[PDB]
Amino acid sequence: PHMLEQCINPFTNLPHTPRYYDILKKRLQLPVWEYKDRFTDILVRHQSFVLVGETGSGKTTQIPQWCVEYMRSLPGPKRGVACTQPRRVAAMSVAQRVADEMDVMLGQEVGYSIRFEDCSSAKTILKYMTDGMLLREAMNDPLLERYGVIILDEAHERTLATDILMGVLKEVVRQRSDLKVIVMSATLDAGKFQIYFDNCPLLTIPGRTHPVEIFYTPEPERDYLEAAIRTVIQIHMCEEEEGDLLLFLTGQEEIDEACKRIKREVDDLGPEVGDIKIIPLYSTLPPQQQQRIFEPPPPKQNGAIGRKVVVSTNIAETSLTIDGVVFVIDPGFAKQKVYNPRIRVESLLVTAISKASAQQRAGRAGRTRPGKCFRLYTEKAYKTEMQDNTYPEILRSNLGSVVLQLKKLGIDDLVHFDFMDPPAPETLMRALELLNYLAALNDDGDLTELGSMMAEFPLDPQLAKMVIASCDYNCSNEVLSITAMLSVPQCFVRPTEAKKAADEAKMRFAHIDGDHLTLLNVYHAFKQNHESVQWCYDNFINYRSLMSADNVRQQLSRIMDRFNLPRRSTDFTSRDYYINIRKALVTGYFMQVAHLERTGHYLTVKDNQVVQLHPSTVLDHKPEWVLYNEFVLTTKNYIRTCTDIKPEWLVKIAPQYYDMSNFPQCEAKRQLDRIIAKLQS
Amino acid sequence: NIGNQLLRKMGWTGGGLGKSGEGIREPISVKEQHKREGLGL
Ligand SMILES: Nc1ncnc2c1ncn2[C@@H]1O[C@H](COP(=O)(O)OP(=O)(O)O)[C@@H](O)[C@H]1O
Ligand SMILES: [Mg+2]
């Protein structure tokens, strides 16, 4: 309860650094610090509680440090604090920050954990991790005994992993009385979290948002990116007051294009236009790039106001604060990964945000000073076109990987699992059906040994199955490489002004049988040219994607070693090299197959989606049967990352799915019948 | 119906999921945005 605290670093037993004390002066002014004793009084009297405070309150940086101090007061062998973040960038950035705040090296006493990015050690006693990574730790530690406190942060974003974690933790605290669970959220959400944890205590930090004037367009915009760029430059030139800009866009490629176009239109006035520092923010940035959002704006010679423009996804909506932002530009859209269980189609979608999200975005303009938020739509569109709240992710997502993790966790009854917002029965059906087809569950719905081992891979079940099954095709070395390339962003750089040159460089790698093997060609060439930045530029290859694929492949191969899964290749001189790899792809992606119809479009098997090959495909012809990685749902339906396959592989490898007693009538079925009757003739 | 068998085998009767059967019965449909048309066009 009261521990001796000399003025030394308790991890080094040496004085704190000058910087430690400079930082300490500032964080004592954070809104949360007022409440430290009230927080402590709750923590030592209750097993779970809810903490609510606006973004900028100090929740993610300060509360976990208070929990560390609490842990140091307890007897026995030292346990840690976990703090989950929905967002990779928030976890990595804030762990660097808090390591500074605690006067320790990142990865020592303070660390982070993302899929394929573990920055922690035996000394780690505070770990920021994605919520998905904590659920993965529970698979080999069901009561999470490495932690004495677990903080589920950003709970209002209601991600799939956070929702599952809430139900897992609700069960863990029934079995463990020493564990403290803290839910933190930006919004009260009608006391939903408190009720869910059996009417636990609530601590609410008052907000400190300055006034924010909102501006609406007079009429709908025909191009929201054009309106976004137009608004940014007008703010930069027409606002008298100092202050930085925060523009919400929807993803990495859209953000880069905006960053290029802003820099050109601005650089199109040599003199007396203030310097602007243009900073992208999206989910895959390396730590060095993440941290640029925090560095100071340019200086003001003839009085031209200098400013930062952060061009960001909804990472910046609640998960962090960029001090100094005064102007927000809100196109009103975000990107969601949506699953339609009726046709078994998952796809990346750009969609209109909720009123709730719009209010948060505008709130970020008011943290430092009175601000302004430019909503690129009409007020009636706000009132009649935007829903009050974002749907929780659990209600619009593919549950295949979540069902697999729950079954691995030993949670067999998924109908009565205590979801805060239970998913639709049909969606749970498609997840069970998927895992059964992949032989991860048997016909009784029980986890099989293959299922159990698939669950250890931090991959879509389709990919995990493919990786495991490829061992029997003596090509796991290459399917590992392909899997790593599929696990990272697009590797082909294609500038707007150099499409022909980028496309000609891409075709240097093109495999005649399609896109999956082209990715293998890129990765092999990257490795044999010794990870060269120059070689990447010479070939319009994305250096960051390939470095990330190499890391993923390394981490995946340790999982293979741990399960004694052999890492094999076939003789490159034999025809079977590329045939074995193409067959292995079928072991995971037999449900993502399309058949070339007589008039030249494709039809997906069973679900009968009219699609065409995505224009970025290397295929210079239309194979009768293609396996595809991604369904792309724009104005047309495209299937992206496409490989030529033979239909007899479908019936031999995945006959449970290619079951002709339920397969609908179509040209594809006619061919499969012919194949099947020939096998029996 | 392999997914509906596994679901009823888990104990599903009908209607919504959850510990009290309170879940939404039908999946929600998300409206996609085409090109870069502003909200409400
Ligand atoms: N990475 C950082 N670099 C510099 N300052 C930071 C950093 N992260 C947080 N801060 C400071 O901490 C303040 C509050 O942070 P935080 O704990 O993340 O609040 P919350 O989680 O309630 O939204 C920020 O406004 C900023 O002043
Ligand atoms: Mg936070």
Side-chain angles (χ1 to χ4, degrees):
Chain A
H2 292 300
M3 305 303 300
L4 178 55
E5 276 181 311
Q6 312 189 82
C7 60
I8 62 189
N9 193 328
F11 312 108
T12 67
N13 294 346
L14 286 166
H16 281 295
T17 56
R19 181 186 72 181
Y20 169 80
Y21 289 113
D22 293 342
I23 296 165
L24 180 62
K25 295 189 184 190
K26 301 174 185 184
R27 46 194 196 96
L28 297 174
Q29 300 170 245
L30 288 165
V32 290
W33 264 84
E34 258 198 284
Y35 288 81
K36 189 177 175 173
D37 292 338
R38 279 170 285 192
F39 170 95
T40 298
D41 290 348
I42 292 166
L43 176 60
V44 302
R45 285 171 179 79
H46 302 270
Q47 175 161 44
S48 309
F49 64 103
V50 178
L51 190 155
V52 175
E54 281 169 2
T55 294
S57 281
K59 301 182 306 292
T60 306
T61 56
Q62 305 306 295
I63 291 292
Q65 298 183 60
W66 300 348
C67 293
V68 166
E69 172 183 357
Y70 166 75
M71 289 304 295
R72 184 164 281 274
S73 75
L74 297 184
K78 292 194 178 294
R79 288 188 232 241
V81 176
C83 182
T84 67
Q85 302 295 308
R87 296 179 187 262
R88 167 177 177 273
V89 160
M92 306 176 76
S93 291
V94 83
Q96 179 66 77
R97 176 58 182 187
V98 172
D100 293 350
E101 288 189 16
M102 293 185 41
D103 228 9
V104 298
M105 295 298 103
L106 172 65
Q108 299 305 298
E109 285 83 6
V110 178
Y112 67 71
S113 174
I114 330 295
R115 179 174 76 124
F116 307 129
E117 305 174 277
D118 183 13
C119 182
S120 68
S121 73
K123 304 190 200 159
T124 299
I125 42 84
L126 168 53
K127 195 162 77 191
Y128 295 88
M129 61 219 299
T130 54
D131 44 10
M133 280 308 290
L134 184 63
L135 185 66
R136 181 146 266 104
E137 288 186 9
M139 294 183 341
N140 295 284
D141 187 3
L143 300 182
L144 288 173
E145 283 166 326
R146 276 173 202 173
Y147 308 106
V149 178
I150 296 173
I151 305 157
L152 301 180
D153 193 4
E154 294 290 286
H156 59 281
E157 288 197 335
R158 297 298 302 286
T159 62
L160 197 45
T162 288
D163 274 20
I164 300 318
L165 273 178
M166 277 190 296
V168 166
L169 293 177
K170 203 186 172 162
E171 179 57 40
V172 172
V173 300
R174 292 205 303 113
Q175 308 187 45
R176 273 188 74 174
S177 61
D178 45 354
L179 178 64
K180 301 299 189 172
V181 170
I182 305 183
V183 177
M184 311 195 298
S185 160
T187 60
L188 189 51
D189 277 9
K192 227 179 171 178
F193 299 114
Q194 305 162 264
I195 295 174
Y196 182 84
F197 287 97
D198 302 300
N199 303 296
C200 62
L202 168 74
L203 182 71
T204 307
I205 314 302
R208 296 184 192 192
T209 304
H210 300 264
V212 173
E213 298 182 25
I214 293 158
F215 301 97
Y216 294 105
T217 63
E219 62 186 5
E221 297 276 354
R222 295 174 185 274
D223 190 308
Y224 69 76
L225 185 80
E226 268 197 39
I229 299 169
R230 174 195 76 209
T231 301
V232 163
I233 69 97
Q234 184 165 344
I235 292 164
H236 185 290
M237 294 186 178
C238 295
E239 292 294 340
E240 310 278 338
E241 174 214 13
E242 308 262 353
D244 302 319
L245 292 108
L246 169 54
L247 161 57
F248 289 92
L249 292 177
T250 69
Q252 158 179 340
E253 306 194 342
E254 183 177 71
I255 282 170
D256 285 337
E257 185 77 341
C259 285
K260 299 193 180 182
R261 292 180 58 184
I262 285 165
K263 187 175 299 177
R264 293 200 190 196
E265 291 194 30
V266 166
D267 275 354
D268 264 11
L269 297 90
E272 93 194 28
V273 161
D275 290 293
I276 183 157
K277 179 135 68 164
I278 311 176
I279 303 147
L281 184 57
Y282 50 81
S283 209
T284 66
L285 280 176
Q288 188 204 226
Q289 268 64 65
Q290 289 178 38
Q291 295 170 15
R292 297 235 314 127
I293 73 176
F294 297 110
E295 63 197 52
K300 178 173 281 163
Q301 182 145 32
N302 51 32
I305 302 277
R307 315 173 184 275
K308 292 161 47 179
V309 53
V310 180
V311 186
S312 174
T313 69
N314 52 17
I315 289 173
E317 181 167 304
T318 68
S319 87
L320 45 84
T321 297
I322 302 128
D323 296 347
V325 169
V326 170
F327 308 100
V328 170
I329 304 88
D330 174 18
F333 293 106
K335 201 181 246 166
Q336 305 182 152
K337 160 114 80 51
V338 305
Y339 181 71
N340 189 344
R342 313 216 180 186
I343 61 186
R344 287 174 285 188
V345 166
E346 196 171 14
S347 183
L348 272 178
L349 237 68
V350 172
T351 324
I353 66 190
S354 66
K355 292 184 176 50
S357 269
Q359 302 190 317
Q360 286 303 325
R361 291 182 183 196
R364 301 295 74 77
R367 177 269 165 199
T368 307
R369 286 175 267 144
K372 293 187 192 208
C373 178
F374 299 91
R375 297 178 165 168
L376 308 182
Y377 39 95
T378 68
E379 187 196 6
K380 76 187 300 306
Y382 177 82
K383 289 160 77 182
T384 85
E385 180 94 58
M386 306 185 28
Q387 293 167 172
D388 287 325
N389 295 95
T390 321
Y391 278 114
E393 248 180 39
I394 182 120
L395 300 182
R396 48 182 168 85
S397 304
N398 183 346
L399 304 175
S401 169
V402 134
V403 167
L404 176 56
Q405 289 180 95
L406 288 167
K407 300 244 55 170
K408 176 68 177 208
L409 266 158
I411 303 191
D412 282 295
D413 184 355
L414 288 206
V415 170
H416 305 94
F417 179 87
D418 193 2
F419 298 107
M420 179 177 281
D421 277 278
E426 292 171 48
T427 301
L428 184 53
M429 293 182 210
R430 292 301 197 188
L432 298 164
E433 155 206 302
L434 169 70
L435 295 174
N436 180 268
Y437 284 145
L438 295 171
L441 308 169
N442 65 21
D443 293 3
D444 285 2
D446 293 331
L447 188 69
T448 66
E449 290 186 23
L450 167 56
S452 175
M453 180 171 42
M454 287 167 54
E456 306 269 4
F457 284 82
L459 304 167
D460 284 2
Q462 290 95 319
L463 272 184
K465 173 60 180 283
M466 181 176 108
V467 158
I468 297 174
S470 66
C471 298
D472 301 320
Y473 293 86
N474 308 131
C475 63
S476 44
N477 285 330
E478 293 74 40
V479 162
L480 203 50
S481 297
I482 290 175
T483 299
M485 296 286 290
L486 296 172
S487 295
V488 307
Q490 244 291 333
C491 64
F492 297 104
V493 186
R494 187 170 199 261
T496 319
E497 55 282 48
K499 280 168 180 144
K500 195 187 179 183
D503 287 351
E504 174 69 45
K506 180 175 72 200
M507 288 313 276
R508 297 169 207 165
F509 300 89
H511 189 286
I512 179 171
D513 290 327
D515 294 316
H516 289 84
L517 288 173
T518 297
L519 294 175
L520 181 67
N521 287 343
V522 173
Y523 181 75
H524 281 168
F526 181 67
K527 298 302 288 175
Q528 58 180 349
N529 292 279
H530 309 294
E531 299 80 28
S532 173
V533 172
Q534 185 56 57
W535 175 93
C536 287
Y537 278 123
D538 294 343
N539 289 283
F540 292 74
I541 297 307
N542 186 309
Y543 174 78
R544 291 181 185 162
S545 298
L546 264 291
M547 289 296 284
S548 174
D550 209 17
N551 174 60
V552 169
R553 188 188 190 282
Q554 291 166 1
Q555 295 309 300
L556 282 181
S557 84
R558 292 167 61 235
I559 304 177
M560 292 189 79
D561 296 350
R562 205 231 305 171
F563 286 131
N564 291 112
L565 301 180
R567 295 156 48 208
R568 292 180 164 156
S569 308
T570 295
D571 190 331
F572 188 83
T573 61
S574 166
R575 68 187 284 277
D576 303 328
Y577 184 85
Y578 288 125
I579 283 163
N580 283 337
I581 299 168
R582 292 158 66 207
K583 291 184 179 169
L585 297 178
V586 172
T587 69
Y589 283 93
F590 57 90
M591 296 169 72
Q592 288 175 207
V593 167
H595 174 260
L596 179 65
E597 303 281 296
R598 192 202 84 75
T599 55
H601 61 276
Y602 280 90
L603 191 70
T604 60
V605 299
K606 289 206 161 165
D607 302 302
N608 302 329
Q609 298 309 100
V610 181
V611 303
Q612 54 189 101
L613 305 183
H614 191 277
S616 66
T617 187
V618 308
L619 291 164
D620 71 359
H621 65 281
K622 288 172 167 173
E624 294 180 19
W625 298 81
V626 299
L627 181 147
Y628 65 84
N629 187 62
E630 179 185 5
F631 196 109
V632 178
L633 199 164
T634 166
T635 301
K636 300 161 180 172
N637 299 319
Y638 297 97
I639 46 172
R640 177 153 59 187
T641 312
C642 297
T643 291
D644 182 329
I645 61 168
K646 299 175 174 153
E648 36 273 316
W649 301 345
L650 303 178
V651 312
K652 288 174 188 183
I653 300 181
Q656 189 183 358
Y657 187 80
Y658 292 91
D659 166 6
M660 296 301 99
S661 62
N662 62 41
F663 209 93
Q665 277 298 345
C666 63
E667 297 177 26
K669 175 158 171 155
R670 272 168 266 279
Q671 226 198 309
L672 296 163
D673 288 351
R674 182 190 54 72
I675 290 178
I676 287 159
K678 196 175 170 177
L679 295 163
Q680 307 181 58
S681 64
Chain B
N1 73 321
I2 312 100
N4 185 287
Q5 288 174 352
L6 299 175
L7 194 52
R8 298 183 186 264
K9 256 185 177 181
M10 279 198 182
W12 178 59
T13 60
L17 302 178
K19 80 176 174 280
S20 306
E22 81 273 28
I24 64 169
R25 301 173 178 178
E26 274 187 320
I28 62 133
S29 51
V30 179
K31 312 179 166 171
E32 82 289 310
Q33 189 62 42
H34 304 286
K35 281 186 306 170
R36 283 190 269 257
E37 296 171 4
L39 192 39
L41 186 64

